[PDB]
Design a protein that fits this description.
The structure is cut from a larger assembly and holds chains A (107 residues) and B (84 residues).
Chain A: E1 4-7, E2 23-26, H1 53-62, H2 75-80
Antiparallel strand pairs in A: 1-2
Chain B: H1 6-23, H2 25-30, H3 37-56, H4 59-81
Helix pairs in contact in B: 1-3, 1-4, 3-4
The chains are: A little secondary structure (107), B mainly alpha (84).
Chain lengths: 107, 84
Amino acid sequence: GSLVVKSGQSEDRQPVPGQQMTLKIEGDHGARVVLVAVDKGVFVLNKKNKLTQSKIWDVVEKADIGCTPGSGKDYAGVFSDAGLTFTSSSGQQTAQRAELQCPQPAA
Amino acid sequence: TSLPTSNEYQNEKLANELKSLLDELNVNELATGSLNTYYKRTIKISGQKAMYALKSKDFKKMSEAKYQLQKIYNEIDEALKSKY
């Protein structure tokens, strides 16, 4: 969807310790948003193990059942190499898959 | 007696306007008792600046303190409307 967080004050400069400030939040309707503010000084000691949207997709992609950029050796390979199984009443079926992870990256 | 002169008017008007705010200073200062520390910190500082400027009768300091003291007042007025 989309989630943006900008300054409510559509004007002015830098605030002063103790001063209030409007905080605009542009997100999807019906969505719940959890917030958190941290002093940048903390990240100077440690910036690892954070939470990023990019790190999320990186995990989703790793859990993909497809193990080939495309195509295959044969018709039964195209489906399997794309994360699918074909089976017909004529006999044409795909290669039996019985292993969770993708092929061990054999360079 | 007739009338004032060049620096005789503007310098007196600013003094009166600055005094009007200083009168209700204790009013606003005591109004921050329920508000945050920010308002209590800003008004106790902007308070002296208005007093010292008044006795000095310096056009610059009086004006400099007039808006200094006027701003904090308005910030307090708005700080109360969120509380009813």
